């Protein structure tokens, strides 16, 4: 045309440029956004419990206070247990590394082979040691420095729970159609709140069941593996499969094959019954994240929000999808994120 | 719709992008914004005093000059006293650290226990030493390098106090409805000014009372604890509770339990009477910051404006709330920050 | 004119400023954009294969699963082979470096010469060692750290292939004229998809033919040179010429002149027949990138997207050209990128 | 209202965001902006001299050439003199540091004292050594590396002076109401030009008078103190007071009290007569910078433009005030910067 | 007015903010912009030669190929010659440094002197050694690492020359009034192209003449000084004067005064005849850069585009001036850059 800079071109480019600026803003302010978001989600999870406890005619402030003391004591105790178990695992690591190393040496002389062993040696180093080394580093930096920030986060959660009673009056007194599209009678947090409550119930059930079954199969670190399964259950399909690995690795490299197969059968039973109780119990909607979008959101949020961004990705992407579902212009993106 | 980039979408994204830019601007220029804001608040605090001293028929410039000399001499003397007391505390620290360490060893052999001690050892390190170590570092960097900037800040305060007499003519001669919404007959600084004056009066009273009562209970560093209580009294509910801790820790770990309980009772008396004189004396408005918003503003301002941003957060959030209270579009946010 | 800031001036400057912001956004988020784009292209390449395998009445998920296992095993094996061959080349390097060094000493005493040898010594260092040193460094950092990200990329490819079946319903259910200009009945990915499929077929043919012919001429690292020719065949005219060099260097510096000439004749035959089968077999369009634009896009993408950006430049520039071809305002740029 | 993002809100936020961007631009390009601005001011200062010398029927180019040679030779000689005197001061420093240290020890045993001496020892270290140490560092980095850039700046000044004759034709031939508001018949540089000329005349007079009087009181570094007084005379009220200190310190710590009082009386005489000749001689306007705004502009410009930004702050703020004085929208800010 | 944020204010601030963004974009992407721009200019220079060679009925591709081989061989040989000569100069440096040092010692005892020698010693260190040291560093980093990028740049030049034949069809087929204002029948590159061709012819003549005359005066590094004169001839008035210095320094410090005066007379003859052949031969326009603007553009471009930005500044500023000459709004800036 006569001008090359079409006004629609300007709209597109301004939108993209300002989105880039916003993302660099979030990536830069991650150390607030992450604790605040996570505190918000924990508050959402714990609010039904506190509300029911109020239904037992218990003072609100008293209830939340005792609940927070319970939670913080449990976290401190769990940090101690994790420190002991983790150190034991660190000092026990290389023995079964060599135990699984030996079959590689056995299988190296394939008839009419052309490659070398040392590179596959490094790949095995990736398999047993290196992934264990990275998990070691991440978890140990957690138990080392986290207590400086876990306390802060719990404080934030306490304040949110305390102030919840006055919040409905504040939303009611403030129409502002954007905010009613975020969380009001036009429920766009009650959607995510229910999902979080149900998913956390399921994850607790899965973690406890896995821990109990592992104890029934007398494997070491049964509790840590149960915790890991619980934590990873939040990522819908990748998380459970990824969590099922380390126990299988331990049981196979220590005990053998038949028991490892039985343990994997146990995990399959767990994840199928909870592939068959999560959907029909409540949340028949089956909140619409296609597996691809789950993985992509995982990578995305974990890249800008940092590691814990990975843990809270899926709830956060659900939030974004719900918010853009009702916006007039953006409904296209919202249906793009959905599943069918 | 036919276009995905709705004009309202552009408005939202431009507003958010430009807010991100502004915040990165403030975070980047913190070393001016902080001293300037703090000098402004100190000038507001000291203006009534100077004005009353003028009412005693004292020259304005003379009055402010003598007052600033008084203030700077007091600050230098207090820095010296703080240096001596702080060094004494540093060299006295670990003894009662071990004194409180021993009961942990006593309580470790809980019947049917499963955890370890070393992690709880590190948690105690967090409790007595580490928090003391961080307070040590922060206060010592203050007394070390602050005198380069405290003098600058006092100079700024002096200039503001000097120029105040001509300011009303300048505001009067300049309608500019935004500025009258910031500070004019449409009072939006006289709101914050009165809050600061009253809160500082209360904080001085609390600090002096705590110092006197601690002296009546012959604890070491009674003056430093009084100063700390005064400084932390600015954060309404978190500050007093957080300030009440270190004296309780010292008295319990040195003397014992009954006297520590008496001291905590004294703090409760102080903070309840000033939970019962702050509101009814003057400022029946009880400037509307919900406790959650207080904590969030604390975290926010302390994150971008740096540490002293935490100290001046609450006045600053009050300023923002008042300014956005009367703006037509933004009144929703203003009611969101309020309390009920 | 009366104002200097013409509105058209604002449009131009806003467009340019926001483009700069976007580019700094991509350059900053390269570690996602690159794996995601590359996974998208690999998925496009492999989709016809999986679809044909489905035509053999094979389950979709089963087909993609087995194909991905095949691919990952092949990559691991190839990494091992590359490690061995690369280490052998590293420890063999300097001998023929000196072998080609000696003719420089022979040719230094040109009659009536004026220069020195040491600078030309450094130029030869650039020729045989240094370029080999840089290739060494790049390839070795690949085989060293890549396995952390190659697995991630393959995972992404697997997810895309898995979700493809539901995608057409999602595009169909979403008109949004921009998206139909990107990939719909208004084909702007089916254009790039076909180009990628055909170019990859040609590149595989070229790589295998070069490997076989080099084996027929019993040169060392025949397989590595075949792989390098395949990889560089993606850059249309520069890539093949640049890839033809290292084998010629090796054969000349080890064996001699006549055999090197025969090998170069073989490469000429390959690149002329595939300068004569690429065009007429299919893709009679001969996707319109003028050689200059090919080189410039190479430099550009390789500068912001990093090294692998160079490899995927040409497909990516084709994408941009196709997208801007149909846009009303930008068709000028699209014809500028074309060839005639 | 129905939308929260009021259009006025967008205007405010866009203005602030773009101002932040501009300031980050200037802060980033300081190493050009500062020499260019300073060269412009020096050219303005020297233009009347060159023009008068032309009135003596001297060739323009010849006049400016000889004047620039004079200036550069004087700067080189002054750098040498400064190097010698500065090194002498550096090696003489600590003796009178201890001389003034001893009275602190004498005054430490105040009756009924509570503090320590070591912190006040560090405060004295701030007083005599540290401020001298910082002045040492700044001046020495000047005399060390400045000659690389002083020559560049003088070159720029020479070019501006050379090209001035053709400039009026260029402004005349270019209406562009913004530029006539910057410098034209609507004088907004002739305002600053006259201020600079008069202030520099006054500063030269003050520097020479102080140097002569100090020589009459046979103090060491009389010339350096005269230079420092001249340089600091540019900041209207803070500068002279700050410059009067180091000579007083030297004379008191070496000689004693009565002579120091006489010297301070001499400075008071100088600064009162030039608080009584600057205003009435010419520039009865008394360019309107309230002392607070002087100090704030000092801090501001010195923060973004770097140290020499402090020296050229006041002229620069005068420029900004004059420019925004006549702009229709911004006249409010202009009256805000003024004095009354 | 009622609003302070005038719409014109927004236009000004948006223009300035986006210009700052663009400049930070160029400063950030300098390592592409510089080689691309420089390759474009070299292609423009060499295009007439190739076109004339085509007029001799020589194949276009063959002609450009042989010309590029010639150029690259000449560059490699010149790099070698430069390495040898530069190393010789480095190891010869300090002897005449001391030779010129001794007259400073002779001239130190000026009657009734007050300064010291050591600072003037450092100034002489600036004169003979330091400037030589900086030139050493810059040139040596060139001959060291440049060959990695010089080859790249020559490749770019080759591609541009190759593709030129099809370019006129592409511009013809694309009206887009902006592009015709950049380079079309509305010539705004044919303006710069002719300037570059003529200026390069003049610079070659000057370099060769200076080299020949220096050889006639048997000074060392006559060729290097000729090259330096050629390179600096691109900056119109500063460049020749700055280039004339090092030969004068060498001849004076080695040989003496009369021969140095003769050499300076030779340079004056050269630069006056080419101050008297450049203008009247062709380019009677005398492309309008006032000397001040030349210097300012030098500083500017050299600051953002880096060192070689200084070399290509003047052509680049000419380009900008020509482009903004015909734009309706910006013609004011274009006349501001001109000369009269």
Swiss-Prot record, chains A, B, C, D, E:
UniProt-recorded Gene Ontology molecular function terms: efflux transmembrane transporter activity
Source domain of life: Bacteria
Membrane topology: Multi-pass membrane protein
Annotated GO biological process: autoinducer AI-2 transmembrane transport; quorum sensing; transmembrane transport
Pfam families: AI-2E_transport
Entry keywords, A to Z: Cell inner membrane, Cell membrane, Membrane, Quorum sensing, Transmembrane, Transmembrane helix, Transport
Membrane-spanning residues: 4-24, 30-50, 61-81, 149-169, 196-216, 221-241, 257-277, 292-312
Primary location: membrane
Phenotype upon gene inactivation: Cells have a decreased extracellular and increased intracellular concentration of AI-2. Deletion of tqsA results in a 7000-fold increase in biofilm thickness and 574-fold increase in biomass in flow cells. Deletion of tqsA increases cell motility by increasing transcription of flagellar genes. The tqsA deletion mutant shows higher resistance toward crystal violet, spectinomycin, streptomycin sulfate, 2,6-dichloroquinone-4-chloroimide, chloramphenicol and amoxicillin.
Positions in the Cytoplasmic compartment: 1-3, 51-60, 170-195, 242-256, 313-340
Protein location: Cell inner membrane
GO cellular component, one term: plasma membrane
Swiss-Prot/TrEMBL catalytic activity: (2R,4S)-2-methyltetrahydrofuran-2,3,3,4-tetrol(in) = (2R,4S)-2-methyltetrahydrofuran-2,3,3,4-tetrol(out)
InterPro entries (alphabetical): AI-2E-like
Stated family: Belongs to the autoinducer-2 exporter (AI-2E) (TC 2.A.86) family.
Function: Involved in the transport of the quorum-sensing signal autoinducer 2 (AI-2). Controls the transport of AI-2 either by enhancing its secretion or inhibiting its uptake and consequently represses biofilm formation and motility and affects the global gene expression in biofilms.
PANTHER family for this protein: AI-2 TRANSPORT PROTEIN TQSA, TRANSMEMBRANE PROTEIN
Name under which the protein is recorded: AI-2 transport protein TqsA
Name of the encoding gene: tqsA
């Amino acid at each position: 045309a006569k001008p090359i800079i079409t006004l629609n071109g300007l709209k597109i480019v301004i939108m993209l440029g300002m989105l880039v600026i916003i993302l660099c803003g979030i990536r830069f302010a991650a150390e607030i956004i992450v604790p605040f978001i996570l505190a918000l989600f924990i508050a959402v999870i714990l609010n039904p419990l506190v509300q029911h406890m109020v239904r037992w005619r218990v003072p609100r402030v008293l209830a939340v206070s005792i609940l927070m003391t319970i939670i913080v004591m449990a976290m401190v105790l769990l940090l101690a247990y994790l420190g002991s178990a983790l150190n034991e695992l660190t000092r026990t690591l290389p023995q079964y590394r060599n135990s699984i190393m030996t079959p590689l040496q056995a299988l190296e002389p394939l008839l009419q082979r052309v490659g070398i062993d040392v590179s596959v040696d490094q790949l095995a180093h990736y398999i047993d040691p290196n992934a264990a080394m990275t998990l070691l580093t991440n978890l140990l930096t957690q138990l080392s420095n986290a207590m400086s920030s876990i306390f802060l986060l719990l404080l934030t959660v306490l304040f949110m729970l305390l102030e919840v009673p006055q919040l409905p009056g504040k939303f009611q007194q403030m129409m502002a159609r954007p905010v009613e599209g975020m969380a009001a009678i036009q429920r766009a947090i009650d959607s995510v709140s229910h999902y979080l409550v149900l998913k956390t119930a399921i994850s607790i059930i899965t973690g406890l069941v896995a821990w109990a079954m592992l104890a029934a199969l007398d494997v070491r670190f049964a509790f840590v593996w149960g915790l890991l399964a619980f934590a990873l259950n939040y990522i819908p399909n990748i998380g459970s499969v990824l969590a099922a690995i380390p126990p299988i690795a331990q049981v196979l490299v220590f005990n053998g094959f038949y028991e490892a197969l039985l343990v994997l059968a146990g995990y399959l039973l767990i994840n199928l019954v909870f592939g068959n109780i999560l959907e029909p119990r409540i949340m028949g909607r089956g909140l619409g994240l296609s597996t691809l979008v789950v993985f992509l959101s995982l990578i995305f949020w974990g890249w800008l929000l940092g590691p814990v961004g990975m843990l809270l990705s899926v709830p956060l992407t659900i939030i974004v999808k719900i918010a853009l579902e009702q916006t007039a212009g953006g409904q296209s993106i919202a249906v793009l994120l959905s599943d069918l």
